[PDB]
Amino acid sequence: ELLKPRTLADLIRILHELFAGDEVNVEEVQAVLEAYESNPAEWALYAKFDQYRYTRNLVDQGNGKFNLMILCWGEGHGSSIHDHTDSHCFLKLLQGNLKETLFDWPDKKSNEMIKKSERTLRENQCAYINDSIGLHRVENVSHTEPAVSLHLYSPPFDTCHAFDQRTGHKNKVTMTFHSKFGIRTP
Ligand SMILES: [Fe+2]
Questions:
Q1: How many angstroms separate the alpha carbon of residue 5 from the centre of ligand 1?
Q2: How far is CA 109 from CA 13, 166, 169, in A?
């Protein structure tokens, strides 16, 4: 029984119930994420920006079944083209807008990675990706508005690949947390 999360804390409680088992019902998780109405006071603690690039701020470690984190995107900040390491990845906008660009897995031949589609993720919308859907890049293309997103990855992963758009070549990146539980972790 999926009820509307009343608050971020309530959402987290619900997520622990939805991830109690071994499998993930993606549509239900996505629906619950979407139904949480972003309330900036509830996540201000986690929304720690860096001037030069987006930051990843751990909110909840789940049952070890998932990482829940908040990403803070300054104007013009964006990600690499990346995969998600055999995990589910949900992305819900808490503030602002992000452009998500989808790419196919490259062939072995060095070739330009051509976008296969793009879309604009708007406040409160929840997107979903996994390796079977493809790779993506996420960008805050705004010149005037920071964006903040809530990401849930299951299982948790701390490495992924970045892909060079000119060639499809990939390199392994270790992801770091800017903060954990509201505490800056330099
Ligand atoms: Fe991603």
A1: 24
A2: 46, 11, 9
CA of 183 to the centre of ligand 1 (A): 23
> Which residues are annotated binding-site positions for Fe cation?
82, 84, 136
Residue (of 40, 73, 42) closest to 55 by Cα position: 73
CA angle 112, 176, 154 (to 5 degrees): 80
Edge to edge, the sheet with strand 170-174 lists: 115-121, 98-103, 135-139, 81-82, 159-163, 170-174
Q: Could you tell me which residues are annotated as the binding site? A: 82, 84, 136
CATH number of the domain located at residue range(s) 1-186 in this protein: 2.60.120.10
Ligand 1 centroid–CA 20 distance in Å is: 23
Q: Determination method here? A: X-ray
Q: Is the peptide bond before 155 cis (omega within 30 degrees of 0)?
A: yes
Q: Tell me the resolution in Å.
A: 1.4
Closest CA relative to residue 69, chosen from 170, 137, 154, 3: 154
Domain boundaries, the chain: 1-186
